[PDB]
C-alpha cells in the first residue's frame, strides 16, 4: 500500500503541475483576445479618411 501511496503522491505532483498547465494553456489564451480585438482600429482609419 505504501509502495502505491508513493505512486499516489507522484500522480499528485503531476496533478499540481497540471494546474500549472492550466496557467500555461488557459491564462495564456489572452494574446488571442488581444490580437482579435485591438486590430480593427488600424483599418478603421480608412473609414475615418
Amino acid at each position: 500500500t505504501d509502495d502505491l501511496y508513493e505512486v499516489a503522491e507522484a500522480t499528485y505532483e503531476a496533478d499540481s503541475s497540471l494546474e500549472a498547465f492550466q496557467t500555461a494553456l488557459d491564462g495564456v489564451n489572452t494574446a488571442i483576445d488581444d490580437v482579435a480585438v485591438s486590430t480593427l482600429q488600424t483599418e478603421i482609419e480608412e473609414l475615418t479618411g
Partner: protein, 48 residues
C-alpha cells in the same frame, strides 16, 4: 477594403460627372451653329 471606398468617392467623378461637364460644353459649342445659321439667315435675307 475601405481603402477603395476612400479613393473612389472623388475619383469616379472623372467618369461620372466629367461626361456631364464635357457634354454641356459640347452642347453650348454646338449651339454656336444654330446661332451662326441664324446669323447667315439674317445676312442672306437682305439680298431679297
Amino acid at each position: 477594403i475601405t481603402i477603395p471606398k476612400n479613393w473612389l468617392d472623388f475619383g469616379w467623378d472623372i467618369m461620372t460627372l466629367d461626361a456631364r461637364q464635357t457634354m454641356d460644353n459640347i452642347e453650348t459649342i454646338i449651339n454656336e451653329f444654330p446661332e451662326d445659321f441664324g446669323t447667315m439667315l439674317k445676312s442672306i435675307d437682305p439680298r431679297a
